[PDB]
Amino acid sequence: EIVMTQSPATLSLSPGERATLSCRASQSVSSYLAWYQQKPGQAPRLLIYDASNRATGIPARFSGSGSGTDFTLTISSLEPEDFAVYYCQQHSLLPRTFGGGTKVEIKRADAAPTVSIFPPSSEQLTSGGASVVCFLNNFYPKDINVKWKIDGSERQNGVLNSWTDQDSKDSTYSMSSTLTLTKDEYERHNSYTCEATHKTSTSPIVKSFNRNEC
Amino acid sequence: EIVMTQSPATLSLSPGERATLSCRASQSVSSYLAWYQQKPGQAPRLLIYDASNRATGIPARFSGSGSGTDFTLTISSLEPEDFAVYYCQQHSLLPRTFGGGTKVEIKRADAAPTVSIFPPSSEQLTSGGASVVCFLNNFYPKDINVKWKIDGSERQNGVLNSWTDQDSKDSTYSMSSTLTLTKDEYERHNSYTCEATHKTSTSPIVKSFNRNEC
Amino acid sequence: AKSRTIGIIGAPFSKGQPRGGVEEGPTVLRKAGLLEKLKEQECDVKDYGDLPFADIPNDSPFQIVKNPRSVGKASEQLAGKVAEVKKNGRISLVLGGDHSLAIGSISGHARVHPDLGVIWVDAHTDINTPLTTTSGNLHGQPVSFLLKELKGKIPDVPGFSWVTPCISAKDIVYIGLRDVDPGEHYILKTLGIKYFSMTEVDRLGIGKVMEETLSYLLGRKKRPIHLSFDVDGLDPSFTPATGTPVVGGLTYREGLYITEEIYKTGLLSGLDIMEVNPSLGKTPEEVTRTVNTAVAITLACFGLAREGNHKPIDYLN
Amino acid sequence: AKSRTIGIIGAPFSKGQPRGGVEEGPTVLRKAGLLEKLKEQECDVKDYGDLPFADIPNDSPFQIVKNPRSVGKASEQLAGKVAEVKKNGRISLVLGGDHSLAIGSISGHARVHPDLGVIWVDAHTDINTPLTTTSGNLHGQPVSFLLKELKGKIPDVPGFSWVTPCISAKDIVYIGLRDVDPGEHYILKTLGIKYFSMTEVDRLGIGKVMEETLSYLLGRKKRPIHLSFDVDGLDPSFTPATGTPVVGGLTYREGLYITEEIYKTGLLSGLDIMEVNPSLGKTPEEVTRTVNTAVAITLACFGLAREGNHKPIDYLN
Amino acid sequence: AKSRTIGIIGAPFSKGQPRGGVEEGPTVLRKAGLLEKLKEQECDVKDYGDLPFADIPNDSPFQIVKNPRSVGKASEQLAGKVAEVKKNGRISLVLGGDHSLAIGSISGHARVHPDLGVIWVDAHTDINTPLTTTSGNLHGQPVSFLLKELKGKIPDVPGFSWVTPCISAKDIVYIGLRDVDPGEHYILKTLGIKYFSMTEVDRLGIGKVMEETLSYLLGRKKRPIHLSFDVDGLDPSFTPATGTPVVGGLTYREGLYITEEIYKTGLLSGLDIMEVNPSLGKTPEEVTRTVNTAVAITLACFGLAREGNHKPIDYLN
Ligand SMILES: [Mn+2]
Ligand SMILES: [Mn+2]
Ligand SMILES: [Mn+2]
């Protein structure tokens, strides 16, 4: 099961210069592997066929090299349509393993998240649930951890974090701190807190509300 | 950073036959690595010096081989004093990485956990805390997940699981579901539940209590 | 004796064939104990080590032929080593690998005995040209480099400058062909090559086939015989762990038989065991059957006959 | 040409045999691409569609014979369709199904050529009578309706009014028999039918067997040959996905061989592929081996010879 | 011409030295483009590929000497390959690796020219014996196997049966010694070996040192010179990515100078670049300085002189 290791896990480079990527083998694949262009929810189309040589509908800038253990994927003329999770994939040993993921983001000026926290509705309370979700918005780069608290004492098993891709226009990111509780647990407490933490956030961004305040 | 991978992660073999273990390299270490005997809280003493040849105070049964990618640690005359977390360790590349862990347990007949659940004291309630812990006891093998519920709705961020080694005499295992709450959260609810789940447990072992029942 | 005097040449080379993994060819045949299974009967076994196969990094392709120069360098190296072990007076046991190596395996054998014969037991003829193949894989073009009747028509594909075609079209017998692409069969019919495919194998019976094969090669004159043997030429019920399995091959019985007729002439002078691939068995049991098959084939080549093998002393003592 | 000019007749019928599931006979053989695997060599392939098999709801049994009228209606319909495709000048590729259909498959073939021969390659003779069987299953009584030497002795079982026995007992050769119930072998010995069972197959060799079979049928006079071929006649190591598997059948090699001798007479004029059943393979791999076997059998009937097949242009160009 | 006619032998071997990682010796020197940086001036460059180093699994230790048989087999193989490339009339560029290989690198060079000289530019003498070392590491015992004045005193350590001591104690000059264990300096003083350590290097000046070195070797008679060159003999400010760095080595200027004096005799006949280790640079910049150093050393050996190199045509045109 030769493990193929992609040394750039993530990548964020502006429309511009070379975006040389790395993929390593645990054996000698020896010029027998390829490169792919998995756009989100699409066909992971071939970039480079046999460690080189640029297959059949490739634009201009997708040279690469190898032969035979640690290979290269050069994106010289970056062309911002190419922002996709890239994959090397060894071939000439069974079973035919893949790389890990080479998310090519957009490099831009680090955006700060706009963070606030939101209750369950009375329409929800007539159904009998509690879903207190904080909503994080327009930041760069991806990494935020959000903590919850039962009036000061932390929460899990409802808490879910889910991120989109990078935006087309302002090129930002995404998270809801999707948390679900019960109506009984809702009514026993007021001060519900959302503690964001981004690289732009020097202090951890806390936004809160009491129950029966809004 | 050549990663050394130990293919037997855990091991449970009776006092008896061969206990051949495996350690693989991401490159050619080429007969340049060793084998260790880390007893819990002790000195991880050398077993086998250079992929073979049995160093200087080794008893009788600790042959091994290699040269040069995927190596062997044979424990032929098992000798039940030898129940320790074992480590291969590559040497002749910098930096000098290690294996993962080769916990050599005792193989015995699968023991069922004795499971029940325990409240906070009034001496605790005069201090103002809540610590509802379930106590799991004398089982084999190690793996149990224990769920908690707020009268039927699950719990985390207090819940802690902690296991000992295997016992000397009956050779069993260990867990407390160490959970901590607040006195206020304690007084708002009664039916506190502990749901064990072991391989011997065909049904998930639920033990419960109401507050002000005991 | 004269026969069962063996020089083993392991040749872990792959770049003629696309399915990488045949370079664990000599490793698995040696760890199945081919050496020691020779050593019961009077086998003068001398291992000459494996050949180093250097990696040309810019082995740039031809029009269709791909990885040419690595194949040509490997077969030139093997031609020197086969000429070396035939100057040692032994029978060249050259096992790989793939049929790309059989270029130098027949070439260096012809460097000592220029008037040999080739029994190319294979599912395929492997006589595509660099121009009129559609693969360009050199595990199926060794025979086209070797026939003198094809000279002036083979391109100067790089790595093959040393290649002198050395055998005649009337001096080669295919046995067990079962899947031929059209270029190879036009060559087969125009040169007048004698061949016994699985049609003619079943027609005469495998024994009358080996009878007429020895009547074709040795019926004119006694001469050295070079059994170059593919392991996909047998049926994939016995060897599924090969590169190109085609159903309908020889039974394992008859493969052993063809080797035993070549032994009982006493004229075995060169042996090839190619296309063994442990990486393509779907179970290791498939690999185990395949490798035990190829080992016992090699045994019955050098006179591990199924009738018996002996040492000439009284055993009632 | 004259040969490899094919009319395909799929006939998904089951009620001669008890194990329901053989009605996915033509479906699996077509989805294995028998049509396109013919079309490489010069196969004039014309699919005539599947035959509709109506369901007689009150197909009331005979004494022992059960589902008689559906079998008789199916074989009468197939006799009309076989006579149609033989008036088209093609070679009738009639594949089902079960041997119950071979009544009309030999009958409509005799409606054009009354002096043909039948090579009934099967594990069984399938010549039980309606009176002296113990099954009453019409997947084993087609041959008893067809021999003129059995007339005045076959009952008027319903559905079989149209049945004229059309072939002579000296004009049929069984090849590969291996399990016969006693009534069929008394018929076999009293009529003086020539047959080569697996005894005689192993005795002469499969090639001398096909040699004497063609010497028996065609040695007197050139005449059309109707290979009606069961797929349990091969060994169940190759076709376990059949209705009645009996161990000890022909090797897959020899099955392909029998078809290739019938091709190289140039006198193939009718072909039956019966008893294919994808529902009885214990794994789908068993079904895959069985169907690829029967497909390549049908290929080697119409001249996908293992020696090679070509189109007559120069390929060095 | 006579000089700058190069046979490159890459030898990725490590088991003489303990710090594993020097087997990426020829890989990094080739990917730094030593071949193409030769090819500007008139360098007849012929790469002969890397040597295969088989792994003896039970390479059991001696008393102190450890991994002996792998070293002896590697140096015997290299002795054959050096004798091969010296029969090719080229200058043997043998780069590894470690000084264990210099046994066969001087041995096969003496197989063609038995009266050569050795300029062993190294921080250490590397002339420990198997008996009177305290390491037993064969990256520091090549010279003790090679001197005829040490015969009858070297043990029969396994792998070294082929070893004939081939050079005289008065036919070797150490240049740049700076850390010697006591056994090696008793050998150095008792044999009367001429040597210029960093004391004598600074005393005469590096130019008067190379003047007297060529006056010692070539002042008697013109004879082939075998510069065997360690890369720790330079100061670790320039090559910190070596196996045994000792501070106080030659400046990079003077290392290039020693190579250029060996060139301007026109008598360079064998070259060793050992102990290059990319795995021990604390930064890759350290590795980059080390490898560019060793590359330009090898350039100034074959006549990439710092004065200039030319092709003899007018360039005002
Ligand atoms: Mn083949
Ligand atoms: Mn049958
Ligand atoms: Mn040194």
Q: What is the DSSP letter of D68?
A: H
Neighbouring C-beta atoms of residue A89, cutoff 10 Å: 17
How close D310 comes to chain C (CA, Å)? 7
Active-site choice (C230, C261, C272, C286): C230
Using alpha carbons, list the distances in angstroms from residue C265 to C108, C213, C218, C260, C269: 22, 12, 9, 9, 11
CA distance B182 to B170: 37
Counting one residue from A and one from B, how many pairs have CB atoms under 8 Å apart? 17
Is the CB of B30 less than 8 angstroms away from the CB of E20?
A: yes
Encoded tokens for C270:
């060169």
Please calculate the CA angle A182-A185-A191 and round it to the nearest 5 degrees: 120
Containing domain of residue A163, as a range? 114-209
- Answer yes or no: C232 catalytic: yes
Query: At A18, phi and psi to the nearest 5?
Result: -65, 145
Query: At A208, phi and psi to the nearest 5?
Result: -135, 170
C52 contacts on E by Cβ (under 8 Å)? 49-52
CA distance C313 to C315: 6
Q: Nearest by CB to D307, which of C182, C183, C197?
A: C197
Residue D125, marked binder: yes
Q: Where are the alpha helices (DSSP H) in E15-61?
A: 26-31, 34-38
CA distance C292 to C286: 10
> On the CB side of E281, how many CA atoms lie within 13 Å of its CA?
19
Strand partners, B71: B23
CA distance C198 to D66: 43
Residues A109/A131, Cβ–Cβ less than 8 Å: no
What is the whole-number distance in angstroms between the Cα of residue D71 and the centre of ligand 3? 95
CA distance B13 to B15: 7
Count of helices and strands (H, E) across chain D: 10, 8
- Looking only at the bridges linking them, the beta strands covering C91-95 and C268-274 are parallel
- Answer yes or no: C59 catalytic: no
CA distance B140 to B108: 8
Encoded tokens for E85:
């490339």
Neighbouring C-beta atoms of residue C62, cutoff 10 Å: 17
Residues B148/B197, Cβ–Cβ less than 8 Å: no
Three-state helix/strand/coil letters over B14-44: CCCCCCCEEEECCCCCCCCEEEEEECCCCCC
What is the whole-number distance in angstroms between the Cα of residue C22 and the centre of ligand 1? 13
Encoded tokens for B122:
């009034």
Residues A23/A73, Cβ–Cβ less than 8 Å: yes
Three-state helix/strand/coil letters over C219-282: CCCCCCEEEEEECCCECCCCCCCECCCCCCCECHHHHHHHHHHHHHCCCEEEEEEECECHHHCC
Strand partners, D120: D174, D228
Residues D201/D209, Cβ–Cβ less than 8 Å: yes
Detail the residues of E annotated as belonging to a binding site for substrate. Answer: 124-128, 135-137, 181, 244, 275
Of chain D residues 155-214, which have a CB less than 8 A from chain C? Answer: 205-208
Sign of CA dihedral C83, C85, C87, C92: negative
Residues E227/E248, Cβ–Cβ less than 8 Å: no
The closest of E297, E183, E187, E280 to E236, measured between CA atoms, is: E280
3-state helix, strand, coil in chain B (%, to 5): 5, 30, 60
Domain ranges of chain E: 1-317
E307 touches chain B (CB under 8 A): no
Three-state DSSP at C70 gives: helix
**Amino acid present at A197:** T
CA distance B155 to B179: 9
Residue of A nearest to C56 (CA): A67
- Looking only at the bridges linking them, the beta strands covering A181-182 and A129-130 are antiparallel
The closest of C13, C128, C19 to C76, measured between CA atoms, is: C13
DSSP for B67-91, please give it: SSSEEEE--SS--GGG-SEEEEEE-
Q: Which residues surround ligand 2, an ion (CB under 5 A)?
A: D 122-124, 230, 232
Encoded tokens for C117:
């014969």
Question: Where are any strands of DSSP class E within chain A?
Answer: 5-6, 10-12, 21-24, 33-38, 45-48, 64-65, 70-73, 85-90, 102-105, 116-118, 129-130, 133-137, 147-150, 160-162, 174-178, 181-182, 192-195, 206-209
CA distance D8 to D272: 10
Strand partners, E92: E7, E270
Query: At D62, phi and psi to the nearest 5?
Result: -85, -165
Sign of CA dihedral C195, C201, C207, C208: negative
CA distance A53 to A72: 13
Query: At E235, phi and psi to the nearest 5?
Result: -75, 145
Is the CB of B67 less than 8 angstroms away from the CB of E21?
A: no
Encoded tokens for C184:
């190879």
- Looking only at the bridges linking them, the beta strands covering A147-150 and C5-10 are unpaired
Structure-solving method: cryo-EM
What is the whole-number distance in angstroms between the Cα of residue C275 and the centre of ligand 1? 7
Q: Nearest by CB to B92, which of E21, E55, E61?
A: E21
Is the CB of D316 less than 8 angstroms away from the CB of C183?
A: yes
For testing the chain C interface, which of D259, D310, D315 should be mutated: the one with the most C CBs within 10 Å?
A: D315
Q: How far apart are the first and last CA of chain A?
A: 56
CA distance C275 to C277: 6
Residues C253/C293, Cβ–Cβ less than 8 Å: no
What is the whole-number distance in angstroms between the Cα of residue E139 and the centre of ligand 3? 8
Sign of CA dihedral D143, D145, D151, D153: positive
Residues in chain E: 317
Beta-carbon contacts of B108 under 8 Å, excluding residues fewer than 6 positions away, are B14, B140, B171
CA distance A74 to A47: 11
CA distance A116 to A194: 7
Name the helix (H) or strand (E) containing D8: strand D5-10
- Answer yes or no: C23 catalytic: no
Is the CB of A185 less than 8 angstroms away from the CB of B154?
A: no
E196-204, Cβ contacts within 8 angstroms, sequence gap of 24 or more: E198/E248, E198/E249, E198/E250, E201/E175, E201/E176, E201/E250, E201/E254
CATH number at residue A161: 2.60.40.10
Three-state DSSP at D48 gives: strand
C20 contacts on A by Cβ (under 8 Å)? 30, 32, 92-93
Query: At B197, phi and psi to the nearest 5?
Result: -155, 105
Using alpha carbons, list the distances in angstroms from residue E133 to A188, C142, E129, E180: 80, 55, 6, 11
**Amino acid present at C248:** G
Q: Where are the alpha helices (DSSP H) in chain B?
A: 122-127, 183-187
E52 touches chain C (CB under 8 A): yes
The closest of A93, A101, A100 to A2, measured between CA atoms, is: A93
**Amino acid present at D293:** T
Encoded tokens for E18:
């303990």
Fold assignment, C1-317: Arginase; Chain A (3.40.800)
Encoded tokens for E55:
């792994």
Residue D309, marked binder: no
Query: At E283, phi and psi to the nearest 5?
Result: -120, 155
Beta-carbon contacts of B6 under 8 Å, excluding residues fewer than 6 positions away, are B21, B22, B23, B24, B86, B87, B88, B99, B100, B101, B102
CA distance A118 to B8: 48
Residues in chain C: 317
What is the whole-number distance in angstroms between the Cα of residue C24 and the centre of ligand 1? 17
**Amino acid present at C20:** G
Encoded tokens for D252:
């897959």
A68 touches chain C (CB under 8 A): yes
DSSP for E146-167, please give it: HBGGGTTSS---TT-TT----B
